[PDB]
Design an enzyme around this catalytic site. Structure first.
Site, PDB file in Angstrom:
ATOM      1  N   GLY A   1      32.539   9.713 -55.839  1.00  0.00           N
ATOM      2  CA  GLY A   1      32.296  10.115 -54.289  1.00  0.00           C
ATOM      3  C   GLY A   1      31.207   9.040 -53.527  1.00  0.00           C
ATOM      4  O   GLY A   1      31.124   7.950 -54.180  1.00  0.00           O
ATOM      5  N   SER A   2      30.290   9.701 -52.877  1.00  0.00           N
ATOM      6  CA  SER A   2      29.425   9.261 -52.228  1.00  0.00           C
ATOM      7  C   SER A   2      28.404   8.256 -52.959  1.00  0.00           C
ATOM      8  O   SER A   2      27.567   7.235 -52.308  1.00  0.00           O
ATOM      9  CB  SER A   2      28.516  10.015 -51.364  1.00  0.00           C
ATOM     10  N   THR A   3      28.194   8.577 -54.226  1.00  0.00           N
ATOM     11  CA  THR A   3      27.590   7.742 -55.021  1.00  0.00           C
ATOM     12  C   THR A   3      27.907   6.192 -55.476  1.00  0.00           C
ATOM     13  O   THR A   3      27.087   5.119 -55.881  1.00  0.00           O
ATOM     14  CB  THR A   3      27.356   8.222 -56.479  1.00  0.00           C
TER      15      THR A   3
ATOM     16  N   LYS B   1      28.984   4.480 -52.464  1.00  0.00           N
ATOM     17  CA  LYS B   1      28.747   3.749 -51.197  1.00  0.00           C
ATOM     18  C   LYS B   1      27.867   2.534 -51.166  1.00  0.00           C
ATOM     19  O   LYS B   1      27.936   1.674 -50.283  1.00  0.00           O
ATOM     20  CB  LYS B   1      28.321   4.723 -50.177  1.00  0.00           C
TER      21      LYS B   1
ATOM     22  N   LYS C   1      20.888   8.249 -54.407  1.00  0.00           N
ATOM     23  CA  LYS C   1      22.270   8.759 -53.644  1.00  0.00           C
ATOM     24  C   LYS C   1      22.839   9.669 -54.390  1.00  0.00           C
ATOM     25  O   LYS C   1      23.076  10.011 -55.797  1.00  0.00           O
ATOM     26  CB  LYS C   1      23.234   7.565 -53.836  1.00  0.00           C
TER      27      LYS C   1
END
Length: 505
Positions: free
Chosen positions: A247-249, A251, A438
């Site tokens: 996921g967003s980790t 980005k 994050k």
């Protein structure tokens, strides 16, 4: 045809090498035990001694006797293995004809459950089955020797002529693990899970400069000294085998590639309204959809998939694939740990838009907690990747500069803002220090937090995973961030890292 005698050879079990932590604390110790064996044919001539012998071995009277009466033509049998030296000399004290003892070794793991999945364990024959015990079996097992003896046709061990080969003891192994940090991490992951009502989790700590894994704990854990529950599930080394979509980790790696392209800078604005972005039939969706314009740091704080998808379309997937690959996501760690999974970093000749986007915000690619920690280590080590090590690093290897020092420094600053700034992951804060990280939600769902500290001059990188936290709030933040806070503060103190967030100089 009934040879009166016959020369025979038996191997002398080798003292298995000491496993220690990086500071010499013992994690696996070869401890004296005694195995008892018999010559049935010598036992057969002392049948009235059997009840006493059977009693002394903890056996049943009638079953023990069946055993010897139906191995009567046979010469070789085991009675019991692995018991204490006193108990071995105790049965020996009966002076039952046919009973012989041999000295053995068995593993004791002093830290026990705390470092179970890292150390692993040996089997009944003192051979490595899991973890380090198996990964470094050849190093830790020395060489079984060989003792040349004499026996008759029916095999009574008359005399030891000589020992044909001296046995070589195994070598000592110092791990990268710091048991003080391991203990801290273990304790806080555990303490966290029970408060969240979580099934399972992981926590990895790395030294960003050396590639050393300073801690690797999973919940649930097991006592390697007491393996009787056979539990199959709770022996998962989750940090190395549970693959998840991160996921967003990831980005910040997309962002690294954006900042390297020459087309983007921190203050650039991206319009993410209305929190969705249509690509053909597929719609990219943000989890929170109360935004229009966000700067690059804002895309991180909000976890805007739409925001990072527009940056990816502009720079190209290839730039993003390239950084992710170079930081070890979906890549072989080279640790040679048993059951270690590699995950998956897809590649394409021609990336469509949907794959470009899903890569950028961290779905479709799958990774382990260890690879993520390793990626974060590279970012925290001013863009330089060091090979992962589960053993103590004395000579730090040359690393590969994968992200430029300048870009790595900017991404760090942004991740520090993610922790600090308004609307940020404020419960990731580490008292006395700046920290950077994050949050995300992993699809195995798990609460993720990845980060490092001190933010202005990093030493430690850390990944926290909590599987399926059981409360009203269940996002990536609320669960994992406070654990990172506490384990990071502790590990920084234990390693005497100077505070970088004082009344400023």
């Amino acid at each position: 045809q009934d040879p009166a005698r016959s020369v025979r050879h038996i191997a002398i079990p080798a003292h298995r090498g000491l496993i220690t932590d990086r500071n010499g604390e013992p994690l696996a110790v070869s401890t004296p035990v005694t195995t008892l064996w018999a010559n049935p044919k010598e036992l057969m001539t002392a049948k009235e001694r059997w009840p006493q012998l059977a009693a002394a071995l903890g056996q049943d009277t009638k079953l023990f006797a069946d055993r010897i009466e139906q191995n009567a033509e046979r010469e070789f049998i085991y009675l019991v293995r692995g018991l204490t030296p006193e108990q071995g000399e105790g049965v020996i004290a009966l002076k039952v004809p046919g009973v012989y003892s041999i000295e053995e070794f068995r593993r004791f793991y002093p830290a026990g459950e705390v470092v179970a999945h890292a150390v692993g364990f040996t089997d009944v024959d003192d051979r490595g089955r899991e973890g380090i015990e198996l990964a470094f079996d050849e190093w830790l097992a020395g060489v079984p020797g060989k003792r040349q003896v004499l026996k008759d046709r029916r095999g009574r061990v008359i005399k030891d002529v000589q020992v044909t080969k001296n046995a070589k003891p195994g070598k000592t192994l110092a791990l990268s693990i710091d048991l003080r940090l391991q203990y801290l991490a273990h304790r806080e992951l555990r303490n966290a899970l029970l408060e969240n009502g979580a099934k399972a989790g992981s926590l990895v700590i790395m030294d960003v400069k050396t590639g050393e894994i300073l801690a690797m704990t999973n919940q649930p854990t097991y006592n390697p000294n007491n393996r009787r529950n056979l539990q199959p599930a709770a022996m998962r080394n989750r940090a190395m085998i549970d693959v998840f979509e991160p996921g967003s980790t990831v980005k910040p790696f997309s962002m690294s590639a954006a900042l390297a392209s020459g087309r983007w800078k921190p203050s650039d604005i991206v319009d993410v309204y209305p929190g969705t972005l249509q690509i053909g039939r597929y719609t990219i969706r943000d989890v929170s959809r109360n935004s229009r314009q966000l700067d690059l740091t804002g895309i991180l704080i909000k976890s805007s998939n739409v925001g990072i998808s527009k940056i990816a379309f502009d720079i190209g997937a290839e730039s993003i694939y390239s950084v992710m690959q170079q930081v070890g996501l979906g890549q072989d760690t080279g640790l040679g740990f048993p059951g270690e999974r590699v995950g998956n970093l897809p590649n394409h000749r021609k990336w469509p838009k949907a794959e470009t986007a899903t890569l950028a915000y961290g779905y479709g690619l799958s990774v382990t907690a260890i690879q993520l920690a390793h990626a974060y280590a590279a970012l925290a080590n001013d863009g330089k990747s060091v090979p992962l090590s589960m053993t103590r690093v004395d000579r730090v290897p040359d690393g590969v500069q994968v992200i430029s020092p300048e870009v790595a420094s900017t991404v760090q600053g942004m991740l520090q803002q993610v922790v600090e700034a308004q609307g940020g992951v404020f419960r990731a804060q580490v008292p006395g220090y700046h920290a950077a990280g994050k949050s995300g939600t992993a699809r195995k769902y798990c609460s993720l937090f990845a980060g490092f500290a001190p933010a202005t001059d990093p030493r430690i990188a850390m990944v926290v995973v909590i599987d399926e936290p059981s409360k009203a709030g269940y996002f990536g933040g609320l669960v994992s961030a406070p654990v990172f806070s506490k384990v990071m503060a502790g590990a920084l103190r234990l390693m005497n890292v100077p505070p970088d967030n004082l009344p400023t100089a």
